[PDB]
Amino acid sequence: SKIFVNPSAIRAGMADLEMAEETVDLINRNIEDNQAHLQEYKYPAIQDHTKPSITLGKAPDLNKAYKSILSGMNAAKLDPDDVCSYLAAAMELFEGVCPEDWTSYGIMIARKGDKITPATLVDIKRTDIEGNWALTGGQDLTRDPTVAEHASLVGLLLSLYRLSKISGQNTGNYKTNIADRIEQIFETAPFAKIVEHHTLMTTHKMCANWSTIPNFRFLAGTYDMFFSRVEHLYSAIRVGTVVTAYEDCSGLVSFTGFIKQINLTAREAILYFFHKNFEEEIRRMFEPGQETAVPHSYFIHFRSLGLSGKSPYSSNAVGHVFNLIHFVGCYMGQIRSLNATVISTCAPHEMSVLGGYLGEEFFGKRSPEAVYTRIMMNGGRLKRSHIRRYISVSSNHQSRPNSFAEFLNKTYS
C-alpha cells in the first residue's frame, strides 16, 4: 500500500541499474576465494589520480629492525610505530612481476611485466624522526635474518590485525584455533620458524587494539591487495590480511550473498525488494564509477586504505536491505543472521514482516508478485505460522544484545 509496492512497478524502473550482475559475481567469487585464507556517505572512487598514502617515521635498517621487533614479540612488548615502519620497509622483500596491466581509479599501478612490490600500490611518506628500535633479552650480536625469516615476522605481525579484529564474548576458543593455525603456517616452509609455540597469542594480548590503528590497518590492506593480484611464494601472509577485503561493506556483501543463496539473478532478486525504502538503498550500492565489478580494484580494500570514512555500503548505510536479508536468514535458521546486529533505525518491524513472507517463500529451496499478493491479503501482518517459526528459531537460541534473535524474542512471543 503506502509501505509496499507492486513488484510489477519495480520491474519497470530498476532496469537502469548498472553492472549489478557483474558486481554480484565478482564479489561472491572473491569471498569464495578468500575462504582458503580465512580457514553524508562518501564514495571511495579516487578522483585526483593520487595513490592512497600514510606517513611513518624514518626508514630503518631492515636487519636491525627485525632484531628489535623479534625481541619485542618474544617479550610481548611491541611498539606499533616501529612495527608499521618495519612492515612498510619490508615491502621491498616481496617482489613479483605484474601479470597484466593494473589500473584502478585512473591510477596506473603497473604495466604488464613491471617488477612490483606492495609499495607500488601506495605512497608511504616518511619523516626524518628515527624509530625507537629498543632490544631486550641481551644486546649480544646475532646472525642476520634471511628473507624467509623476514617473511615469517611480517606474516606474524600482520596477523595481529586479524586477531585484534576478533573480539567479543564466546570468541577466544575460536581465536585460539586461529592463532594456532597462523603460527603453523609461518613456521612451515617456505616460511621459517622464528618464534616458539604460543608466542603469537601472548603477544596479541598486549596488542588487542591494533586493528584501530589506521596506519597498521592501512599496511594490512596494502599487503592484502598486493597478494590478491600477485601470486607470490609468501602469499599465505593473507591469512592475517584477508579480513581487510570488503571491510565496512557488510550491506553490499549481505546483498550479493543473499542473491546467491536464493539462486536468482540480481535483476530478478531485486523484484522481491518491494518495500518502498529499498530503492534508495539499492541505487546507493550500485552508484557508477566505483569499480565494484573490476578485479583487483582499490575498491576491494577501500576502507582499510583510507579512501572513505563513511561507507555507502555498510549495514547502516543500507539498513532496510540489511535488516530484511537477515530476518530471512533468521527464518531459515542461519546462526550468522540470528547473531547479526539489527539496524534499529530502519523499520525492523516491517522488515521482519516481509522477512517472514520471503522466508516462507524460499524455505526448503514462484514469483515476487505472489509474495506481494499474500502480504497485502493479510493486511501487511505476519501469519501465525510465520510468528511460530520466528519464535521457534529465536526462543531456541542464545539471543545476543541488539541481535536479530533478541529482536524476534521481544517482538514475537
Numbering used by the authors: 59 to 97, 171 to 496, 544 to 591
Original paper wording:
Using a chimera of phosphoprotein residues 1–53 and full-length nucleoprotein, we purified and crystallised the protein and solved the structure to 2.19 Å resolution. There was a single molecule of the N0P chimera in the asymmetric unit. Residues 27–447 of the nucleoprotein could be traced, except for a chain break between residues 352 and 399 that remained unresolved due to its being in a flexible loop. The structure of nucleoprotein contained the N-terminal and C-terminal globular domains that contained multiple alpha helices together with a central hinge region that resulted in it having the jaw-like structure typical of Mononegavirales nucleoproteins. The phosphoprotein chaperone module had good electron density and could be traced from residues 2 to 40. Its N-terminus appeared to be essentially unstructured and was followed by two helical domains (Helix 1 Pro8-Arg12 and Helix 2 Met20-Gln40) that were separated by an unstructured loop. The structure indicated that the interaction between the phosphoprotein and the nucleoprotein is mediated by 13 H-bonds and three salt bridges, with Helix 2 of the phosphoprotein being amphipathic and forming a large number of hydrophobic interactions within the binding groove of the nucleoprotein. The ABLV phosphoprotein chaperone Helix 2 occluded the RNA-binding site and interacted with RNA-binding residues Arg168, Arg149, and Arg225. Phosphoprotein Arg12 forms two hydrogen bonds and a salt bridge with nucleoprotein Glu403, which would otherwise bind N-1 Arg357 and Arg361. Despite the two different approaches to generating the N0Ps, the ABLV and RABV crystal structures have a high similarity (RMS 0.69), giving confidence that the ABLV structure was unaffected by the engineered linker regions.
